[PDB]
Amino acid sequence: HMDALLTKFNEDRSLQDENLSQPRTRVRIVDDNLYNKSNPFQLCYKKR
Amino acid sequence: MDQKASYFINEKLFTEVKPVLFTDLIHHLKIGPSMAKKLMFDYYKQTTNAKYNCVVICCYKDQTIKIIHDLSNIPQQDSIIDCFIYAFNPMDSFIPYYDIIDQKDCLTIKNSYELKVS
Amino acid sequence: LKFEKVYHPSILISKKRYVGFSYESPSQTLPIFDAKGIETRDGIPAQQKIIEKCIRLLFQTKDLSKIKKYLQNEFFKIQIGKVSAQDFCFAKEVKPQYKERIPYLVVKGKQGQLLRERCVSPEEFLEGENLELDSEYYINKILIPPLDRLFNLIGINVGNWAQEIVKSTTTLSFLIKKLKRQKEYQTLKTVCRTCSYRYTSDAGIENDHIASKCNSYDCPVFYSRVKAERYLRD
Amino acid sequence: NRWVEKWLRVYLKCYINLILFYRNVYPPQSFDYTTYQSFNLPQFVPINRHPALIDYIEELILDVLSKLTHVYRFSICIINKKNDLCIEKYVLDFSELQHVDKDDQIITETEVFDEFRSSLNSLIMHLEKLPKVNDDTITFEAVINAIELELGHKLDRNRRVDSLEEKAEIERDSNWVKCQEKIKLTSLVGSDVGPLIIHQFSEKL
Amino acid sequence: NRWVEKWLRVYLKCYINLILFYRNVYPPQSFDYTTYQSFNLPQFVPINRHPALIDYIEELILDVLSKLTHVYRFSICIINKKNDLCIEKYVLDFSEQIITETEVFDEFRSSLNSLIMHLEKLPKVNDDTITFEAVINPPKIKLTSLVGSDVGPLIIHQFSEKL
Amino acid sequence: INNKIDDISLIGRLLICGNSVDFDIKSVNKDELMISLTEFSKFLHNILPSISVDIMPGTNDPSDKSLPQQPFHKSLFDKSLESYFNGSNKEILNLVTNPYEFSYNGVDVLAVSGKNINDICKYVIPSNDNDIEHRLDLMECTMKWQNIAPTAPDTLWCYPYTDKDPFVLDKWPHVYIVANQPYFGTRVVEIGGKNIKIISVPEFSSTGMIILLDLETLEAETVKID
Amino acid sequence: EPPFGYQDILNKLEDEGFPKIDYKDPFFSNPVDLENKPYAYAGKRFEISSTHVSTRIPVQFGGETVSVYNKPTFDMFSSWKYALKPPTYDAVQKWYNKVPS
Ligand code: SF4
């Protein structure tokens, strides 16, 4: 089909110009929620 | 000239018949997904008596990502940029089985917090 | 002299002891059960229900291995502990007069074999073997109504069946068991609030407390909810 | 062993009920693709639930696994309502089994499930690649080409039977009858895992 | 003869009894399909419980296997109206020193399993308005063959031309 | 699968909300629960090198069937994946409840698995009806009053609510997540307290409509997975 | 081969003294029950039967039931077929039609 021809047309991204043994890490995620609070909705350890 | 991939696809297609979905290619070669699209296109280009064809995902998105089953039709993706070819299937249906694979070599995008053994 | 709904088999131990599949006309099918006059008193309902199902099974297809698996299943229900707990409700004449239907529910058994004939509290909140037991007097009192009424004339010993049955990931198993009886208890709460809708106008959020405070001595979901809430204290 | 005939039971469940699905001997709307009929399936195998029928299927598999060394070749026979002539004879094998040896090694759960998934997918492939004409009026029956058996006399000789396990065993020898003993034959890719050699083919007419 | 006589005579008597039940020459619920097994088989073996009729078919199969040594092509036709063609021709073709007792005793299972495969897979034209007649040689007939007896010394072609 | 390449740049840390494995309780047993849970382990150990995940049970996956619901560790995972939560305490994956206050240095967002509003939207509603644009505003209401939505709330034998922890809490988020609707719905409404974006992510068999959320200009982006 | 009668067979069965149409003794489908002996009964004999093929008396050809009473012999090439009638197309079809009803 011409779907394969679209892949034939798009030869510009040979490898996306990534090293590809380099992981480009994406996010500097903060996640302040995880450690320094009790979760109210969570169980009680003495109850469990 | 990367036929080093192609025979490995040939056993998994033929000598046993479990389909490749993506992950065998990334396990074998650790090539790019664009390069994997090129490789699967090359396998499609150098097809000789495929028992049945694959169906592609489409790179052109328009807030839609659909596996094509109306192969002749163009399902809401009319001004199409491209397609990523994968899921070459012997069977009637496209189901693989899913398994843990080596990923420390194969992970294209790593974790924002890398896991610690601690 | 009418015709009046003859029976294909008939159990015939005594005077005024009918039971057969009665049916008035040949055009009818699934012949009507007849329970007139029958010897099969207080009349604790589980004996009547197992005798009815046993006769229904013995009489629809004329086979006895299904009776075997049904009676063995019922002895598992008593033994392992899946008890609906309306199965045994005795009542003395201790206070015509209706100072009766007293709370006395002997399915409980005895922990230490200590209290003589005192399985009294029908909603006693404790663990497993003070709600179900295997070796007692009422296992004899449940093995005699099949044997005397039905199994005498056929000769098969249901007491031999009782004698044959009387002897003969895990945290995820406990988890999925809690899920099983949690969905069962929520289904019981659903049944209870749909039952208790007649006292609210249309409200549904206060339905839970009125559903929890329903106390019948005789209701076929209430005792299952009692043992459901017996489980959740653990 | 114990785990290996569980794998044989699941593999034969997949094989038998998949042949039942692709021959349209039961309506396809009763079938649904699934992984759980009493155990863990390797693939999503279209299984109709129909508890008499699945009782029959696990019955037949527990019959075939009961002998487990006489059988060198389990098979599935396909008979029309029109004639008793064989339409297809799907070949399976119980050759060089672990269970006859009773070797503990090796489990290789993912590897044996891998080769089972391969043989199932080959069964899928050569069950769509023959066409669909006269899709109804087909039935099912079993056949075993086995190397050294005769058990059917165990009903006889005035035996007195006491245990349910040998009640089952007398049902096993009761259910099986020796028959009286080509046109086309097609290839199928078998599983080639070490302890479970299942060299499975197909026959046509 | 030569030691196939006993299992051949019980095979024809049980074949007649199975024809009598599953094509209802007599009433279907006039039988006992419960307490008799013919060979080591799962299925029901419905002999007529009539002592005079079991003696009648006893003498029938006993005399046809008395004339076995020069017997001709065997059949059973069920007749109430004009059909004039054989229904179930279990042709007893006389062969002839092979020692086959166990194997032929197993072989009469598969003959009788081909019989029941012809019997339970069989339509219904009319209830009880038919009568059988053993004979040695319903709009339209139909051809159907069943299994042979190659393991047995005598081969039985076991044709059943229904209607 | 690449949008060349910006989809990876937008995507953050994986957030499921409820519905980890669909099943019905009266038809399930041991091994078919582990079949779907180990295939969930396959999925999560497949995606865990790529994207870190935060997981929550609560409507039809195993739970207390309450809004405060204990999230079940060590059951969703095979032995390959089981040792990661022992190795990494809460970073790459942790078990969180049906509500959770995910805070990105003060971008507090609330999750709901959906049952809390889906029982109101379909199961227990004879009245208050003048259907995505109707049901979108039911959880707007449930956000506004912070109130008792469901019919069996807080459902605990010991310590249900100790005058600190309402199941629909009192501290308000910037986005509430609710799940398992027929269609997609994503509006934003401003109140006198804060701004709140409405998130109704559909059930996955109802065409998915899978969503990006927040945190650049507080903007959401769905994509049709069918 | 002149047969017996047509519907009067039932009358003949009544005439020698048998039941005109037999109604079945309730039977054990599983033979591990009956405490694996028909002698287990009450003060009088009831001799409860079994429809399973282990506890069946054979067909009584004349005055004798017959088995081979001999050694079963193993065969080298032999195909063995299954004797249970399978559920049909029609049974599963009517069962899936019964699911909406
Ligand atoms: S337990 Fe009480 S409220 Fe519930 S259904 Fe029974 S009678 Fe009604």
Author numbering:
A (entry chain F): 0 to 47
B (entry chain G): 1 to 118
C (entry chain A): 1179 to 1218, 1221 to 1275, 1304 to 1376, 1423 to 1488
D (entry chain E): 2 to 182, 196 to 219
E (entry chain D): 2 to 97, 106 to 146, 194 to 219
F (entry chain F): 244 to 373, 391 to 486
G (entry chain A): 525 to 625
Authors' own words:
It belongs to the B family of polymerases and is composed of subunits Rev3, Rev7, Pol31, and Pol32 (24, 25). The Polζ subunit Rev7 is a hub protein that directly binds Rev1 and is a component of several other protein complexes such as the shieldin DNA double-strand break repair complex. Rev7 is a member of the HORMA (Hop1, Rev7, and Mad2 proteins) domain protein family.
We then used single-particle cryo-EM to visualize the structure of the pentameric apo Polζ holoenzyme comprising two Rev7 subunits and one subunit each of Rev3, Pol31, and Pol32 arranged around a central canal. Upon DNA binding, concerted movements of three Rev3 loops (948–960 aa, 1050–1094 aa, and 1095–1107 aa) increase the size of the DNA-binding channel opening, from a closed to an open state. Our apo structure shows that one lysine residue (K1214) of Rev3 protrudes up and points toward the pore where nucleotide insertion occurs. Our apo Polζ structure shows that the safety belts of Rev7A and Rev7B adopt a closed conformation in their Rev3RBM1-and Rev3RBM2-bound states, respectively.
